[PDB]
Amino acid sequence: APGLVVGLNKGKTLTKRQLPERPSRRKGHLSKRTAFVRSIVREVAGFAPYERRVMELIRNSQDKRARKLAKKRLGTLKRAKGKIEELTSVIQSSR
Amino acid sequence: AIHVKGQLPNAHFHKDWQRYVKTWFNQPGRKLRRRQARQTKAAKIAPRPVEAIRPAVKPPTIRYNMKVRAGRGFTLEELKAAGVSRRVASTIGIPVDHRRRNRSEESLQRNVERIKVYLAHLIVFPRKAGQPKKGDATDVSGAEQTDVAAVLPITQEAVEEAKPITEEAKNFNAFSTLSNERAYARYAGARAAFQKKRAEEAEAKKK
Amino acid sequence: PTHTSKTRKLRGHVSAGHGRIGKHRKHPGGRGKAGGLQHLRSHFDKYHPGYFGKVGMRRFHLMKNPLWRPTVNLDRLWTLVPNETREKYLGKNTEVAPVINVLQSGYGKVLGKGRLPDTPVIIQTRYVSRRAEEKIKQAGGVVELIA
RNA sequence: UUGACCUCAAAUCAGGUAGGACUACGCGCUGAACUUAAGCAUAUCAAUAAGCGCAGGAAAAGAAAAUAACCAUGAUUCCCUCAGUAACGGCGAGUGAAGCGGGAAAAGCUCAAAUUUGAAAUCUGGCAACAUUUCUUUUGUUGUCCGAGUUGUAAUUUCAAGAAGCUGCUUUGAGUGUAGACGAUCGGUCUAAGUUCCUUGGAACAGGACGUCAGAGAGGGUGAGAACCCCGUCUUUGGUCGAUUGGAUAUGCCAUAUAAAGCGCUUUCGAAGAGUCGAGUUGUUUGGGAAUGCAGCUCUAAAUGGGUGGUAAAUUUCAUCUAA
RNA sequence: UGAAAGUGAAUGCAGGUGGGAACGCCCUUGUGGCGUGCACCAUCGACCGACCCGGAAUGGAAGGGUUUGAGU
RNA sequence: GUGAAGAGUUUCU
Structure with a gap:
């Protein structure tokens, strides 16, 4: 904290305190009951046809092809990698 | 067509x-209408103050962070520190701002003292006349409408x-410090990346 | 007022000062500043050079608050303090030195122009030029940076 | 055969409701061209004119899927400024916002997602009774029955939190009458003063003499320029109705008022909106520039997830917010 | 000042030269000699920013330039 | 949408 207007830790130096936890920022956390409901719904339903195709590609070990298919199906590569990780976990749990 | 002097x-x-x-x-x-409206509001809410107590906050830019102005409402942390519940604050005329937070003890204490001063100067009429409950005032006879800022104004930071001049001040090079800090702020990421790449390359060569 | 206008003096003169040959027809050379590259070029290039073209790089969503930095020179530094402080400190020897908060006065950077009295002073500013720092040190004062 | 449920019908069934007019302002859809660019097609006119749908006394917006990058701010709206600026534009003609700051005004909240399960505690309608009224015209309460509702009506919760718990803290609305008043007030005003003389004139309200009142010499009428002829103007209390806890010891005095909230330490949990976000493309629009917003089509989500941080892409952090 | 990141105006009486208002002093009556010299113009320099250099991880300080700015 | 044949863990006719 240089206490200046330039540098890595610029700005006036005060007595920093611990902010209270914001309940809104808790969003995105997975609850036990929510996970249970989602697992039941996954059991009741199945997988989308694109999800099955991606799972088959992962089983065939065509990782790049599966990633490209997931990216095209879902849009952004970030969501593609998340879906790939989820489907890989499903496959290895089946194994 | 344009044929004369001056800007286009x-x-x-x-x-x-x-x-x-x-x-x-x-x-x-409009000025008369607004004055009449606020006079009518003052009469109808008397003896309550016309303007509610407001906190002191710092504006959010370097152009104005050296000043102090009036905020929207007191934070929950400030109300808890001053001993006022969020539900009772509205009843007694203390605005509550759930969005603002106290990142510094300076701002927390600055607003807490304001709430304490307001509470000390506040007269709370009993819910039932002649039966002062917890927090009510037993001397509500001398109650009149006063300006909140007349007793609790917003104060600017004093210089x-x-x-005395210190030896550290003598040896301080302000321009050199500013130049070094400016150069460091932009080249630190490059230097950190260079160190990480050097460590990775050295480990890979070792492997 | 109307009675002092040139229109009153032009009553009885047919052309109203606009000529018999060229007259005062509607826009005969276009509207506004159109034609600055074709038929108004002799005026644009002579009186407004640099009008046509692109120079520099764009900056999307420019905000001037982070760039706010008015400057004050050294010869105006002692003007910022009140008269009482000037009498109490200027021209005399004291254990303490007066503090001039340039940021509180309303400036972001201290620039070195003019001279300073031979008396120490504490200049509190976010930025300072190199020459200003040398002159302040020569005068006997120091500059401490603030945020 | 019947009943029940489900779905769908009919009735001049019982009770209701909508249309249409007004368009200055308001919320949207659709949507030009004249014109400027000295021509003209993008642009401009203009996200305007015309057309269409829909409200109120205001409408809309509104309590952040907001800014910022700070010592940080903090619902919406409007004014000044930002600013003719960033930016857009055959970068031509032209177009053109937003953060911060000052001011006006300020007000916060409600659902869905929870098992009440030791008792659907919820609501509508018919009938009857009892109240009430701007009011025989209005608005309710109670009892009973029938329906709605378990494919979910009530209660505690809405993230600012909160629930399950744990241990000690305090306990409250409606009828009358007086004094001061407050909307309409109107039994209406104590509400001041020359119409004296002479001249002219058809008429004096003109001129002159002598006066008067003024918190009233604003204005209008009267046979010509009238403060004192008339209405008025200025000042100023009161008979009345109603809002009558709008207030005070609203006293006086009925039961409002025995269990609902109140903060406190400790943990365990903390349910949070889907053809939606997001991605691509097309059209339109915007200052929004490898898309500002809107819409059509294709693909189609996730849970520390998702949106935003104004240059497209990948990766690692950070800040802020919590959409459908 | 630069597109920008940024940097940011005294060697000196805030400089020298020529003309120059006004004033003062001497001449000795000449369209006079001397001393300063406001305004303004011309000119030689100095300083700030930009450009081009030498170049003595990060910094560009003394040293410079035939230049450039709507600067001091 | 559902099935049967031909074919270089998959879909062309």
């Missing part, structure tokens, strides 16, 4: 601007008149 014309009057002309011939009338 820039008039933005190529639309039907004459049908959207706003005159101000009602300015004295130091003078102080």
Whole structure:
């Protein structure tokens, strides 16, 4: 904290305190009951046809092809990698 | 055509601007109407203060962070520190702002003292007349409408008149410090990346 | 007022000062400043050079608050303090030195122009030029940076 | 055969409701061209004119899927400024916002997602009774029955939190009458003063003499320029109705008022909106520039997830917010 | 000042030269000699920013330039 | 949408 207007830790130096936890920022956390409901719904339903195709590609070990298919199906590569990780976990749990 | 001296014309009057002309011939009338409205509000809410107590906050830019202005409402942390519940604050005229937070003990204490001063100067009429409950005032006879800022105004930060010159101040090079800090702030990421890449390359060569 | 206007003096003169040959027809050379590259070029290039063209790089969503930095020179530094402080400190020897908060006065950077009295002073500013720092040190004062 | 449920019908069934007019302002859809660019097609006119749908006394917006990058701010709206600026534009003609700051005004909240399960505690309608009224015209309460509702009506919760718990803290609305008043007030005003003389004139309200009142010499009428002829103007209390806890010891005095909230330490949990976000493309629009917003089509989500941080892409952090 | 990141105006009486208002002093009556010299113009320099250099991880300080700015 | 044949863990006719 240089206490200046330039540098890595610029700005006036005060007595920093611990902010209270914001309940809104808790969003995105997975609850036990929510996970249970989602697992039941996954059991009741199945997988989308694109999800099955991606799972088959992962089983065939065509990782790049599966990633490209997931990216095209879902849009952004970030969501593609998340879906790939989820489907890989499903496959290895089946194994 | 343009043949005269001066800057080139820039008039933005190529639309039907004459049908959207706003005159101000009602300015004295609006001023009188607003004054009458606030006088009526003062009479109807008497003896409660016309303007509610407001916190002191710092504006959020380097252009204005050296000043102090009035905020929207007191934070929950400030109300808890001052001993006022969020539900009772509205009843007694203390605004509550759930969005603002106290990142510094300076701002926390600054607003807490304001709430304490307001509570000390506040007269709370009993819910039932003649039966002062917890927090009620037993001397509500001398109650009158007063300006909140007349007893609790917003105060600006004071500057130091003078102080002795220190040897550290003598040896301090302000321009060199500014130049070094500016260069460091932009090249630190490159230096950190270089160190990480050097460590990775050295480990890979070792492998 | 209207009675002092040239229109009153032009009553009885047919052309109203606009000529018999060229007259005062509607826009004969276009509207506004159109034609600055074709038929108004002799005026644009002579009186407004640099009008046509692109120079520099764009900056999307410019905000001037982070760039706010008015400057004050050294010869105006002692003007910022009140008269009482000037009488109490200027021209005399004291254990303490007066503090001039340039940021509180309303400036972001201290620039070195003019001279300073031979008396120490504490200049509190976010930025300072190199020459200003040398002159302040020569005068006997120091500059401490603030945020 | 019947009943029940489900779905769908009919009735001049019982009770209701909508249309249409007004468009200055307001919320949207659709949507030009004249014109400027000295021609003209993008642009401009203009997200305007015309057309269409829909409200109120205001409408809309509104309590952040907001800014910022700070010592940080903090619902919406409007004014000044930002600013003719960033930016857009055959970068031509032209167009053109937003953060901060000052001011006006300020007010916060409600659902869905929870098992009440030791008792659907919820609501509508018919009938009857009892109240009430701007009011025989209005608005309710109670009892009973029938329906709605378990494919979910009530209660505690809405993230600012909160629930399950744990241990000690305090306990409250409606009828009358007086004094001061407050909307309409109107039994209406104590509400002041020359119509004296002379001249002219058809008429004095003109001129002159002598006066008067003024918190009233604003205005109008009267046979010509009238403060004192008339209406008025200025000042100023009161008979009345109603809002009558709008207030005070609203006293006086009925039961409002025995269990609902109140903060406190400790943990365990903390349910949070889907053809939606998001991605691509097309059209339109915007200052929004490898898309500002809107819409059509294709693909189609996730849970520390998702949106935003104004240059497209990948990766690692950070800040802020919590959409459908 | 630069597109920008940024940097940011005294060697000196805030400089020298020529003309120059006004004033003062001497001449000795000449369209006079001397001393300063406001305004303004011309000119030689100095300083700030930009450009081009030498170049003595990060910094560009003394040293410079035939230049450039709507600067001091 | 559902099935049967031909074919270089998959879909062309």
